[PDB]
Design a binder for this molecule. Structure first.
Ligand SMILES: CC[C@@H](C)n1ncn(-c2ccc(N3CCN(c4ccc(OC[C@H]5CO[C@](Cn6cncn6)(c6ccc(Cl)cc6Cl)O5)cc4)CC3)cc2)c1=O
Ligand code: HEM
Length: 527
């Protein structure tokens, strides 16, 4: 022990007498070996889920997870069961697959897990400060409450003809259609659907002013900001590059535009019940008296529009793509449209949308096969014991839940990779609380979150956009169906998802060929 500790000090010193060709090369090799040693040691633990073995420190299973998460989850499930962890770019993600995982994560106590600590870097740089994940959970709960106030049956009743008008205007004016001058055409659905989504959501949620603005070069800011909404933000939220400056600039310029409208309306007391802007002007005071600022209101609007943008656009693209090889479904949907709208002699209303179950089943089935968000996260805040196991998930870990994975299991949905809207006969609702309920601040929602079908999650972070989504997707598809037939270019089929984008959007270029059902029909109005 005497000469031992001396040779420790000697050894520390001889280390520095190494050529750096050796010293840098061991600066790499040492973490690599400890990593493997720590993993081998880790596997001993009884109070830890199996950890997926990986070679590269820090990076972890990022590549295979990133490129094909559901295949990754399937392989891990086979070897280890439903609970397992894996390292991902410096973090430890504990996956819990299936309905019990949904319960473990979505109904976890506010104290145990944090969504804002998982998500804030993704969103705060894009939306702005003070809202959504840049604030405490109870602020979020009430912001969801505020937004829900513009998402009522009466609002949907007034949105439908606005959304309809936008779809027709797009058919009339967009270079991708121009139905008054073309009877057939080819389109990339990842060009047309993001455009139709932003036009329809602008007009209805933001109002005529902000929609009007999309016909100016102001539209280039949306693109700039949109490009800033990327999973890279999870790792690099701010880097001194043109991309990040374009984004930052856009967030300032767009929120400034919203603030201009807001202050303009208040100045004239032109505060009605037209749109989400009016709504948040009348109704954005928290339960402790603090009022949202005009800046926070605008940042909230950006997030809502942005979130709704990507989930919905990706979804209507997938609907288009699945219907492109299924002329039978198109036909079936067309007949439902003729019946409900009396051969087209009835105008589409919100109430009539509700009497189109096949259409709604089509949305529902698309969301089963193409959950836009394949992985939902929470950062673990307090150590968590996994019920009926010896597993304890320690603070500093992340829990990862994936209803999108369960959506694609045959055990829960027979023939899960087949598109079949009739699996939802007797069950065309977007979702519905199968039993008892609970209120976190934005309204009574289902207490249990064990449904195998769960595109809108559940618990305190449950989506509040599902009825707006169905309204938007519904009006849009109703008009697509009554106006066009479409199919694939010869030899093409449904693309595989891109699991590396923000949403599980189709892999490009995803093209379909459209043709007018009534070549002679004209869309009125000015252009
Ligand atoms: C680097 C190597 C490469 C191979 N690699 N290695 C890993 N990956 C990778 C891993 C994971 C992912 N992602 C995909 C995106 N994903 C994700 C995206 C958004 C998201 O949103 C959850 C919250 C926050 O945003 C919204 C989204 N939303 C919900 N409804 C509508 N939008 C949200 C909620 C509320 C509001 Cl107001 C706005 C928004 Cl945006 O909900 C959650 C997860 C995480 C995993 C991507 C790439 C790679 O690409
Ligand atoms: C196809 C359409 C959509 C799907 C599948 C979807 C899905 C989801 C999911 C899964 C979550 C929870 C994520 C988690 O648990 O971590 C969520 C949250 C949320 N979504 Fe959506 N969404 C959709 C459309 C919309 C729309 C149109 C809006 C706004 C109009 C919207 C606004 C929100 C909001 C405000 C939250 C709450 C965030 C939180 O509480 O943390 N979503 N959505």
């Amino acid at each position: 022990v005497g000469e031992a500790l001396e040779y420790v000090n000697i050894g520390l010193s001889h280390f520095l007498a190494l050529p750096l060709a050796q010293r840098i090369s061991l600066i790499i090799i040492i973490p690599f070996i400890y990593n493997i040693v720590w993993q081998l040691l880790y596997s001993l633990r009884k109070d830890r889920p199996p950890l997926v073995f990986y070679w590269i420190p820090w990076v972890g299973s990022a590549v295979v997870y990133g490129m094909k998460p559901y295949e990754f989850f399937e392989e891990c499930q086979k070897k280890y069961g439903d609970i397992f962890s894996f390292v991902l770019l410096g973090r430890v993600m504990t996956v819990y697959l299936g309905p019990k995982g949904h319960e473990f994560v979505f109904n976890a106590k506010l104290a145990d897990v944090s969504a804002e600590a998982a998500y804030a870097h993704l969103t705060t740089p894009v939306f702005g400060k003070g809202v959504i994940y840049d604030c405490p959970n109870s602020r979020l709960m009430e912001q969801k409450k505020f937004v829900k106030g513009a998402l009522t049956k009466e609002a949907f009743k007034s949105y439908v003809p606005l959304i309809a008008e936008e779809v027709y205007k797009y058919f009339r004016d967009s270079k991708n259609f121009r139905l008054n001058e073309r009877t057939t055409g080819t389109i990339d659905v990842m060009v047309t659907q993001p455009e139709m989504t932003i036009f329809t959501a602008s007009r209805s949620l933001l109002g005529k002013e902000m929609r009007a603005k999309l016909d100016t070069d102001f539209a280039y800011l949306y693109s700039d900001l949109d490009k800033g909404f990327t999973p890279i933000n999870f790792v690099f939220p701010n880097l001194p590059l043109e991309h990040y400056r374009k984004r930052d600039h856009a967030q300032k310029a767009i929120s400034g535009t919203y603030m201009s409208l807001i202050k303009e309306r208040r100045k004239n007391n032109d505060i009605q019940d037209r749109d989400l802007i009016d709504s948040l002007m009348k109704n954005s005071t928290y339960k402790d008296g603090v009022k949202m600022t005009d800046q926070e209101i605008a940042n909230l609007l950006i997030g809502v529009l942005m979130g709704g943008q990507h989930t919905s656009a990706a979804t209507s693209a997938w609907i288009l793509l699945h219907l492109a090889e299924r002329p039978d479904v198109q036909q079936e949907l067309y007949e439902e449209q003729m019946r409900v709208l009396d051969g087209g002699k009835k105008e589409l209303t919100y109430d009539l949308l509700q009497e189109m179950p096949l259409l709604n089943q089509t949305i529902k089935e698309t969301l089963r096969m193409h959950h836009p968000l394949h992985s939902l996260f929470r950062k673990v805040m307090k150590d968590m014991h996994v019920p009926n196991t010896s597993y304890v998930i320690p603070a500093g870990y992340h829990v990862l839940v994936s209803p999108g994975y369960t959506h694609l299991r045959d055990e829960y949905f027979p023939n899960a990779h087949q598109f079949n809207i009739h699996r939802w006969n007797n069950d065309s609702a977007s979702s519905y609380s199968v039993g008892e309920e609970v209120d976190y601040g934005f309204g009574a929602i289902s207490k249990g979150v064990s449904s195998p079908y769960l595109p809108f999650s559940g618990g305190r972070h449950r989506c509040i956009g599902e009825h707006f989504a169905y309204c938007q997707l519904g009006v849009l598809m109703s008009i697509f169906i009554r106006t066009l037939k479409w199919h694939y270019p010869e030899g093409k089929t449904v693309p595989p998802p891109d699991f590396t984008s923000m949403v599980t959007l189709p892999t490009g270029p995803a093209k379909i060929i459209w043709e007018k059902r009534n070549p002679e029909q004209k869309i009125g109005g000015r252009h």
